[PDB]
Design a binder for this molecule. Structure first.
Ligand SMILES: Nc1ncnc2c1ncn2[C@@H]1O[C@H](C[C@@H](N)CC[C@H](N)C(=O)O)[C@@H](O)[C@H]1O
Ligand SMILES: Nc1ncnc2c1ncn2[C@@H]1O[C@H](C[C@@H](N)CC[C@H](N)C(=O)O)[C@@H](O)[C@H]1O
Lengths: 234, 235
């Protein structure tokens, strides 16, 4: 017996900053372990990259066939497992899937409704669509000070698009985490390290000075805004 | 410099097997243990082990040389068979001398019953090794608030800031301290009482009628308010 729920969570943490991406993959995997059976036959992963999610997925789930996708063949350097390299928005999906899973990749998509339609057509009845992406305040400090950043869907955008694509929402949540760095230069070092070129001295100095607007008692904020979703073909 | 403080807020919608609420809390705490704690911890003291919902997860994911299990009631021992590396410390944890030289003190869904948490945290500090771990789940003030309002029965719970201040006072650094307020939405008030009996927690018609004050769009609310903590003895 499943019951609907709504929740609010809040707290503080004191953790490594270089592992944010893997931590998001761990949080998505922890959700998979709830909603999904331990055994699955056919899984398709969109945008596997280095495999931060892939490692956790095979460790927690018994898969018989795993299809991995990413834009570039260079990711296979980091690696019953098939590969489909290319733009997922034009690739032929593997068909008759038990689950489509994707961590931190859908924010790069040009036409999300059309991609969701292809996800719906490729999944079995009651097939799983499970993903993490990011919401409108992801890296908001960087967008405010540099003018660069993606335009992100909010939670209601996703709720609407998933419903029109024919999916049942089992979990849909937004999390907002402020990391507090000791100095503005530590923020840029973090972004350079985690993979998110030299700037001019003037741009750098203006950036450091403008970052005073994000100073807290704990430090200078950098915001991550992941969205987590467990959905089902209805 | 590799560690940064952070603050977070999460919100969303979900579905849960309502019967698994206490097991889910144990799993959530165990996930935090796995994130923060080393895989091997020689000496571990569990407070309020009960039937072992947290104990089984702890032994599964951590290499423990001496596991000291406490509960108020000896009856909990019936839920364990041929448990390995265990020392039993049956009794009121608020009166018992703690085991010495601990690598971790851990507790799931038991601290809400404590009559004197500040003194307990002092005993935790004294029993732990240098930078030893104190890791627990408990509940906050909105836990089962609908049942407290309608029946008058319920505990007084510490809030998150109470814990923050008490841990720092007792000599612990806080690696993780968080709360989740979750409203479960049942189809009818009858289903709320069935859930409560299954999980182990004129008047009946008045209870059903009184539950109208908790009617939402999704159904009739029952709130759980778990609190999770990863802490370490300050060097
Ligand atoms: N249109 C696209 N088709 C396929 N892969 C894409 C597309 N756009 C971006 N990607 C990949 O999406 C990945 C996104 C990265 N944030 C890595 C995600 C990876 N799952 C992880 O969490 O480690 C990169 O490997 C991109 O190359
Ligand atoms: N003063 C006390 N000293 C020791 N154990 C206690 C005390 N008060 C309550 N308990 C135990 O705390 C436990 C709380 C229960 N919610 C079970 C928790 C258990 N860790 C579980 O996850 O199943 C019960 O077994 C109680 O008997």
């Amino acid at each position: 017996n499943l019951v609907a729920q709504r929740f609010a969570k809040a707290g503080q943490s004191y953790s490594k900053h270089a592992i944010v991406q893997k931590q998001i993959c761990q949080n998505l995997t922890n959700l998979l372990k709830q909603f999904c059976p331990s055994a699955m036959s056919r899984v398709f992963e969109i945008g596997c990259g280095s495999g931060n999610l892939t490692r956790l997925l095979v460790e927690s789930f018994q898969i018989e066939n795993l299809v991995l996708n990413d834009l570039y063949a260079e990711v296979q350097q980091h690696f019953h497992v098939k590969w489909l390299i290319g733009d997922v928005e034009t690739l032929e999906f593997p068909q008759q899937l038990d689950m489509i899973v994707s961590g931190s990749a859908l924010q790069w998509m040009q036409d999300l409704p059309r991609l969701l339609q292809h996800c719906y057509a490729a999944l079995n009845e009651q097939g799983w669509l499970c993903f993490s992406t990011f919401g409108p305040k992801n890296l908001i400090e960087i967008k405010e000070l540099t003018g660069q950043g993606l335009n992100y869907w909010n939670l209601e955008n996703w709720n609407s698009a998933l419903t029109q694509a024919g999916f049942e929402i089992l979990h849909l949540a937004q999390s907002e985490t402020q990391l507090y760095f000791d100095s503005p230069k530590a923020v840029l070092q973090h972004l350079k390290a985690t993979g998110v070129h030299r700037w001019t001295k003037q741009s750098l100095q203006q950036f450091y000075q403008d970052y005073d607007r994000f100073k807290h008692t704990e430090g200078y904020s950098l915001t991550y805004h992941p969205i987590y979703c467990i959905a089902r073909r209805m």
